[PDB]
């Protein structure tokens, strides 16, 4: 598959087998940032699930354990001192998925311990009747980039454990977030600050985690209202966070946002699979599928001679270049 060629190329260009970490760029001077490494972890897991090449599948399965090992070697196992609740939760969510694939108890303990630290200590009802703080060092804002990923992490932990506590957490987080961090119609706000209120800046990765938490809640509950929520957020994305030809936007120069199409595509694939399997929203499903295929082909067609795609789809960086690889590993 094109997904096989894209992932092997991405590994050949950016994977460091000594440190067991991705390089940040094609100069190979520094390794990827901590949180982005959890998102390239998930990319390896998504290529693992996508490929029907059994030799590549087995090599990616090994790489799932190596990405964790390289990160724990550099940083330790206990990430609860990191001041960013979102740094912790990206890795808790990756760890839950690694448990689903491998069954290695260390990944369940990592996921649970890190999720529980954030939800139990950083969910607050003093400010705005709920929601998780951005930071554990200072409590001034509650952000989409911690709240929707936390919901997703809780839904993985519910799927793994069937402990209803995790479904209750996912539901409480998502309900609060739809009320306080969206316009009620699919546009996901960046954050809500104590002093200055809502900041209605939308981005690919916050549309993405909203969509993924909504689809996950649909799968856990069978309540169609959650798939409606996902559809409205996908429709916002396809009509607003795109150029005039319908290609998803380039969000640089911000280093966190430049690769956010990676997180968006991952979640849009969950919505695509669920609409295809359920027959929900069939008119939207057919149009969504056409729009995704157009985007994936615009990514495919943007490769250099080493089969790496820079994130401006309309020196190569691993986060920016990851989005095309994710798009081809739906
Ligand atoms: C947590 C963790 O990954 C840490 O390493 C990151 O530094 C941290 C970044 O999050 C902040 O910045 C992003 C991007 O902010 C910019 O884009 C926004 C959307 O357009 C805009 O509102 C903001 O003013 C900036 O221009 C935000 O998306 C986050 O909410 C947060 O402010 C990770 O959160």
Report CA Rg, the chain: 19
| Residue 100, CA atoms < 13 Å, CB-side half-sphere | 19
Determine if residue 243 is left, alpha or beta; phi over 0 gives left, psi from -120 to 50 gives alpha, anything else beta: beta
Q: What distance in angstroms lies between residue 191's CA and the mean position of ligand 1's atoms?
A: 9
191 Cβ closer than 6 Å to some ligand 1 atom: yes
Mutate to test the pocket of ligand 1, among 190, 206, 209 (most ligand atoms within 8 A of CB): 190
153 Cβ closer than 6 Å to some ligand 1 atom: no
256 Cβ closer than 6 Å to some ligand 1 atom: yes
232 Cβ closer than 6 Å to some ligand 1 atom: no
Resolution in units of Å: 1.4
CA angle (148, 134, 203) in 5-degree steps: 50
Query: Atom 21 in ligand 1: which residue has the minimum CA distance?
Result: 201
d(CA 166, CA 251): 33
Q: What distance in angstroms lies between residue 60's CA and the mean position of ligand 1's atoms?
A: 30
Mutate to test the pocket of ligand 1, among 94, 256, 264 (most ligand atoms within 8 A of CB): 256
d(CA 81, CA 136): 9
84 Cβ closer than 6 Å to some ligand 1 atom: yes
d(CA 315, CA 25): 7
Q: What distance in angstroms lies between residue 78's CA and the mean position of ligand 1's atoms?
A: 23
Q: Among 9, 268, 46, which Cα is nearest to 276's?
A: 268
Neighbouring residues of 237: CB distance < 8 A, sequence distance ≥ 6: 186, 204, 207, 211, 248, 264, 268
244 Cβ closer than 6 Å to some ligand 1 atom: no
Residue 31: which H helix or E strand, with range? none
Other residues' Cβ atoms within 10 Å of the Cβ of residue 277:
9
The two three-digit tokens of residue 43, written as one number: 């990319």
251 Cβ closer than 6 Å to some ligand 1 atom: no
Which residues partner with 31 through β-bridges?
A: 23
Q: What distance in angstroms lies between residue 256's CA and the mean position of ligand 1's atoms?
A: 7
Give, to the nearest 10 degrees, the angle between helix 282-300 and helix 261-278.
140
d(CA 75, CA 56): 28
Query: Atom 25 in ligand 1: which residue has the minimum CA distance?
Result: 254
The domain tally of the chain equals: 1
d(CA 58, CA 316): 27
What's the domain range around 77?
A: 1-330
Query: Atom 24 in ligand 1: which residue has the minimum CA distance?
Result: 201
Atom of ligand 1 nearest to the CA of 33: 5
Contacts 24+ apart (CB under 8 A), 293-297: 294/246, 294/247, 295/246, 295/247, 295/248, 295/265, 295/327, 296/327, 296/328, 296/330
Atom of ligand 1 nearest to the CA of 86: 1
d(CA 190, CA 56): 38
Mutate to test the pocket of ligand 1, among 114, 201, 210 (most ligand atoms within 8 A of CB): 201
The structure's method of determination equals X-ray
């Amino acid at each position: 598959s094109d997904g096989d060629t894209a992932m092997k190329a991405f590994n050949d260009t950016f994977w460091d087998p000594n440190a067991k970490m991705f390089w940040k760029d094609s100069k190979r001077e520094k390794h990827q940032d901590f949180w982005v490494e959890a998102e390239l972890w998930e990319l390896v897991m998504d290529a693992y699930q996508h490929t029907s090449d059994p030799a590549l599948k087995a090599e990616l399965k090994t790489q799932i354990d190596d990405v964790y090992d390289g990160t724990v070697a550099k940083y330790g196992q206990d990430w609860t001192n990191n001041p960013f609740n979102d740094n912790i939760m990206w890795w808790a969510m990756g760890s839950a998925r690694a448990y689903q694939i491998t069954g290695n108890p260390r990944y369940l303990e990592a996921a649970r311990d890190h999720f529980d630290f954030v939800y139990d200590t950083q969910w607050d009802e003093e400010f705005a009747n709920g929601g998780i703080w951005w930071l554990n060092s200072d409590h001034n804002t509650k952000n989409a980039c911690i709240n929707f990923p936390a919901a997703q992490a809780a839904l993985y932990l519910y799927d793994i454990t069937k402990d209803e506590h995790y479904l209750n957490a996912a539901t409480k987080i998502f309900r609060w977030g739809k009320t306080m961090l969206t316009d009620g119609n699919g546009k996901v706000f960046d954050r809500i600050e104590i002093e200055h209120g809502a900041v209605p800046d939308a981005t690919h990765y916050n549309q993405g985690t909203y969509i993924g938490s909504a689809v996950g809640l649909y799968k856990a509950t069978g309540n169609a209202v959650y798939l409606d929520d996902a559809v409205k957020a996908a429709k916002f994305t396809k009509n607003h966070l795109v150029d005039s030809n319908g290609v998803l936007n380039y969000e640089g120069p911000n280093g966190d946002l430049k690769g956010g199409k990676t997180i968006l595509m991952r979640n849009l694939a969950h919505l695509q699979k669920t609409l295809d399997e359920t027959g929900q929203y069939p008119e939207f499903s057919a149009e969504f599928d056409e729009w995704l295929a157009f985007n994936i082909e615009m990514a495919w067609s943007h490769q250099n001679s080493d089969h790496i795609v820079d994130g401006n789809w309309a020196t190569y960086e691993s986060w920016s270049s990851a989005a095309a690889v994710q798009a081809l590993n739906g």
